Amino acid sequence: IFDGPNVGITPYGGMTRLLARPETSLKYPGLAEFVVLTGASLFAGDALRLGWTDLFTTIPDMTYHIKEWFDTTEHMHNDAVAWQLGHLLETCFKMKESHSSAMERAAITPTRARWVEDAFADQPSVNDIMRTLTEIEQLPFQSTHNTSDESHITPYTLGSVAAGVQRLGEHRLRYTLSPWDITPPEDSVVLKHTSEMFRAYVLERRGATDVVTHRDAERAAAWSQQRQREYDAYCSLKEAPHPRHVYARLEGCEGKIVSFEFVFEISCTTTISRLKSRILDALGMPRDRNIDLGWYLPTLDTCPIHSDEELMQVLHTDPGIEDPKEKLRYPPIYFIVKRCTLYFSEWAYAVKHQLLLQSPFALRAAFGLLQEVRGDGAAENVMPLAETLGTEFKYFTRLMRRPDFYRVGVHTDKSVEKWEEIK
Amino acid sequence: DDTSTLSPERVALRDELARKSRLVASEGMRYYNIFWVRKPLDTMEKEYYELKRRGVDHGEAIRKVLQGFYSGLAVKKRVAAIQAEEAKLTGRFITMREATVVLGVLAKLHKEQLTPHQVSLLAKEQGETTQSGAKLTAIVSRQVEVKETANDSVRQLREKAEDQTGFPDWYTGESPTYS
């Protein structure tokens, strides 16, 4: 994370140099501006493709193995050292075997590269950059130039609906009796001490043979059968039409919340797709969007909803949480809606929403700094490390004085409980 | 060192998968392990976990993955039969019903020990049968003579081509013309 125009300062740490190498301009034109302006995270895959480093590993507790490997080594002659180190590198850190392009962690996965170079490549200001961006947000969903990509789903808290119920259930009081046997039986059960069951056997003659039976067995059969029929009533009734008010919040930097009155008929999958079709109808998107529904819990957790039988359980378990001043005809539910696909316009909206969200002075400054390190852009004109640290220092030193950084931006990134304790 | 990389859960999973169909288990390794090819057991475990994280329960996920495998196999052997047909009417390929004629020959040769002369004679009269041989052959029971239906031949294969008309032109459908 090379950020800090978000805390109102220019980036430091010399990585500026790496971003300005003529190599990076070749492979990912525009990426340098993307990461320096927008505070944005690069990952292993991105650092490998840019050729910032040669080495990568998936092995647990690598450090121990390095230790024990260099314990078994013997001499100090640089022939020996060269081979030992080299063999270590080849067998683990270079990916010769058991590695794929799907598996390496990458933010800039190739559609994203195309987008970045459309937005940020070769633009002579921050201002040009955002009237460009503004013009990209405006594209329809049907244009050729609005291109989609796989979006990485931000993970839910609970991960399953059952987990949702259980998690919700610790803030509640269990009943001593399950819903189907609470209601008194239509027959009448005289309560005895426990012991008087065991003395209730009896001897009857069935056909030609002697038989020991319970005297009360049939009575208990009527009882258990009745309880089963009440269970059936209960379940069939959870499937009955549920007229609730639906809130759906689209996950993303663009706040939009859709509200509509929906009737859930959970007896004859198709119902989830009905609800999703409706949601998309209101959001103004084609009905072919791949949409992940999710349950927003009163505990501030989140679930995926994969199935209708689960959705029924969500309706039954959450009574709704409502401000009564605002009058709703039906109990609300709160869904979050994740998009399995980002469009170009969408992504651009996000990135502009961040550029507006960080200190303008440090945005413009950091742009100046990148283009000062970059220089001409030829392999020679790029500053070496020694000059880059010095330059970043020059800008940092000049910005830090301003009230913007120290008085405001420094406390920006605090946690929530920190702000609570301070308040 | 020998310690299973497979955790007990995995063990139970691919064991259940393996016991519900032997085809899936054997596919990769029938004889020796072919280890540079992917294996159905593995691919199926992969898409099983895939199903589980989309919220499909145990039973239905298993039977669904298995259905995937079986349907793929269905495709494959449909293709095999579609080409099998072509190959049989090409004339040089053989299913069991003709193979019984080959075995027939080898067995007749062994049972009654034959001189190479007798063999060549067999060949030429079986060539006569094979080509000129006729359906509907008659035996004399006398007065009364009965006709029955024989084995295959080439002349039969002609008469089948003319719609048993005995004529080369039965097709009224449009075709090219020559003058």
């Binding site: 993970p155 808290t157 | 955790s7 859960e9």
Partner: peptide, 29 residues
């Protein structure tokens, strides 16, 4: 056991996964 071997596992920490949410999603128990 109060003494442990190199290639042998040492004692399990008792619980009495929810808390691995930050980790590899596939990482099991």
């Amino acid at each position: 056991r109060v003494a442990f071997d190199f290639n042998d596992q040492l004692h399990p920490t008792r619980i009495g996964y929810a808390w691995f949410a930050s980790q590899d999603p596939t990482f099991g128990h």
